[PDB]
């Protein structure tokens, strides 16, 4: 698994691969690891599939009820905090790392990382997953401030492809999502379009 999010002026870019294995056997090769918690908030998931799916469903329920009560669109920080509380309460049971990313009118496009242990922190770019150890130097060297929306999709695709070639648990297709005020744009990069 390799997941990543990058901030740009006006929104966030999320990317993931699509392989789920059981040992050395690829149980699924077209997995979708980008899940919409609300209209403009997404999470990328890594770890045990059961734990991440159950926690995402629970947080979706709670955030929807909160939004209906308050009669307002929710914040990214609220969803990050709900995930943090559930991950910290059951840290002896769950095995789940999450990236939260979204856009809210109060603070723009933001991204938070909730690793194993129920910690929470904000970052300009955030990588996670088993295959992310092979692209730390690349993202350190290549990232710069003031990137445009179209310069963040290419950077994300390059980093994910480089992680895919070297990791045994990463593969498949590359799924990208761009989140800004107007909406969410989703796309898939098949085998011909993956950088080489």
């Amino acid at each position: 698994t390799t997941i990543m999010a990058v901030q740009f002026d006006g929104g966030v870019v999320l990317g993931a691969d699509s392989r789920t294995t059981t040992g050395s056997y690829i149980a699924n090769r077209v997995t979708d690891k980008l899940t919409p918690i609300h209209d403009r908030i997404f999470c990328c998931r890594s770890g045990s599939a059961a734990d991440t799916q159950a926690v995402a469903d629970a947080v979706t329920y709670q955030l929807g009820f909160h939004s209906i009560e308050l009669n307002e669109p929710p914040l990214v920080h609220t969803a990050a905090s709900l995930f943090k509380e559930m991950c910290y309460r059951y840290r002896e049971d769950l095995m789940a790392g999450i990236i939260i990313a979204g856009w809210d009118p109060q603070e723009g496009g933001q991204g938070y990382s909730v690793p194993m242990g129920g910690m929470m922190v904000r970052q300009s770019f955030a990588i996670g997953g088993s295959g992310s150890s092979y692209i730390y130097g690349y993202v350190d060297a290549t990232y710069r401030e003031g990137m445009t929306k179209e310069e963040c999709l290419q950077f994300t695709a390059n980093a994910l492809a480089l992680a895919m070639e070297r990791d045994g648990s990463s593969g498949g297709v590359i799924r990208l999502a761009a989140i800004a005020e107007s909406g969410v744009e989703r796309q898939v990069l098949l085998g011909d379009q993956i950088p080489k």
Binding site: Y88, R91, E92, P115, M116, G117, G118, M119, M120, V121, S133
Partner: protein
């Protein structure tokens, strides 16, 4: 908390003529990976108390939200009473020990600094409930590298000044950067005085690599 996961390294503290100074670096390591490099491990509790914690970072973040609400609730009464630096030390010892006995510890080492009523406080709280007070403090690997360095100054000259303590606390971040594998070159300082709590950072240390040429 059976396993520590993302952790902090060490906290330093020393008392001077009219207050206390505490220092800690800005890094959270996940094993040996140095994963988060701009995290603050120093808190301001109220206008005369400051806190620094090492160990698991999720537990420190939890204690931070539990201790912030307890201070907020008491200022709502508007009665003229505030918690002393020593009251938080006593409360923290009870909180640690009550979870030690349930076999669900909080993986942290805590350093409390304060200045109230013309008397300076520097206290140490441990994972198991071992708590005490001293003129200087260091947790983790600073108990081996930095504590000998402070406890040599604090015997020749038992009473320091603000500048003498600020220089001493930076001579120890250089030795602790040379010889500790989980350190970083960006730290942060907090000072409590009669005025209040002042946080300054990030700072950096100048190093010397001359011996590399005698090899």
């Amino acid at each position: 908390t059976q396993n520590p996961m993302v952790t902090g390294t060490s906290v330093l503290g020393v008392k001077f003529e009219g207050g206390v100074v505490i220092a800690a670096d800005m890094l959270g390591s996940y094993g040996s990976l140095a994963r988060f490099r701009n995290i603050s491990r120093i808190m301001r509790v109220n206008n005369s108390t400051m806190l620094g914690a090492s160990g698991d970072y999720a537990d420190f973040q939890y204690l931070k939200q539990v201790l912030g609400q307890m201070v907020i609730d008491e200022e709502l009464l508007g009665d003229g009473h505030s918690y002393s630096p020593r009251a938080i030390h006593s409360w923290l010892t009870r909180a640690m020990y009550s979870r030690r006995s349930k076999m669900n510890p909080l993986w942290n080492t805590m350093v409390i600094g304060g200045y109230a009523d013309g008397e300076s406080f520097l206290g140490y709280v441990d994972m198991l409930g071992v708590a005490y007070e001293a003129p200087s403090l260091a947790t983790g690997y600073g108990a081996y590298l930095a504590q000998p360095l402070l406890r040599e100054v604090l015997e020749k000259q038992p009473v320091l000044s603000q500048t003498e303590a600020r220089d001493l606390v930076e001579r120890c971040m250089r030795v602790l950067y040379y010889r500790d594998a989980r350190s970083y070159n960006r730290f942060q300082t907090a000072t409590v005085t009669e005025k209040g709590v002042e946080i300054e950072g990030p700072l950096s240390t100048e190093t010397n690599w001359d011996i590399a040429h005698m090899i």
